[PDB]
Structures are given as C-alpha cells and as structure tokens.
C-alpha cells in the first residue's frame, strides 16, 4: 500500500513532514567539510573529463 504524489496544496501543507533542523549531510559532500572549507585533494580542472 502506497500513496501517490498529491495534487492539492492543502495536502502537502497539512501533512506532518518535519523540517530541517540540524546540519544537513550528503553522502559524498561530507569529505568536503562545508562550501567554505571545500576540500580538494588534487588540483584537477573543473572541466577535466575522465578518459
């Protein structure tokens, strides 16, 4: 039993969905600390295409 994505605004609003409270996490962007302590191991170019 599953639910479809809603079509009205009041069902999205009144649904008990918690908000973000603590620090958010990403599974690959947690080695890099924050966008201000964006860590780079090697100085490869941002347009570097892997062969």
């Amino acid at each position: 039993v599953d639910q479809t994505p809603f079509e009205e605004d009041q069902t999205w609003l009144l649904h008990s969905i918690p908000v973000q409270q603590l620090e958010m996490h990403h599974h690959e962007k947690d080695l890099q600390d924050l966008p201000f302590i964006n860590h780079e191991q090697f100085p490869r170019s941002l347009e570097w295409n892997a062969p």
């Binding site: 603590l22 620090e23 924050l34 201000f36």
Partner: protein, 85 residues
C-alpha cells in the same frame, strides 16, 4: 562561526523523550552504560549514561563530573544525565 559546530556544547512536558535524547527508542544504550573491558574503577561516569532501573534500585555510587546522586527515584529512568542536572 558555522552552524552548530561549537566545540563546547531544560524542563519540557510534551518534548520529554525527544529533547537532547536519542531519536529512536529501537536503538540501544550508549557505551558508558556498559563496561567495556577490564577496569580498575572510574572516578566519574560520563554525562551520556542513561539512568536505568538499576541506578535507583542498587544505588552503590553515582558520580557525574561534581555531582552526587543520593536521591533515587523512578522519574529519572530512561533519560541521560544531561537534563537530570
């Protein structure tokens, strides 16, 4: 300063089990509520040990870094030592 990254880290009735406590009840007690290995005895226990039934039942010594818990009761059972002080 970044959000909630300070290295040096309250009564509430509807948020009793959910404020400065574990999110789920399925999870087990932390590491300080159990004996890891061979110990000579600790001078004080950590602040994250959950007050269990045997804390108020036996009552040998409760030393929290100080703090002396000599008044045992059952309203503290299920809660860590942070909100008890």
């Amino acid at each position: 300063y970044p959000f909630l990254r300070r290295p040096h880290i309250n009564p509430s009735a509807p948020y009793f089990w959910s404020f400065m406590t574990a999110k789920s009840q399925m999870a087990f007690l932390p590491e300080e509520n159990y004996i890891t290995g061979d110990w000579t005895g600790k001078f004080f226990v950590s602040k994250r040990q959950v007050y269990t039934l045997q804390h108020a039942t036996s009552g040998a010594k409760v030393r929290v870094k100080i703090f002396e818990f000599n008044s045992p009761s059952r309203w503290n059972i299920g809660k860590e030592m942070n909100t008890l002080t």
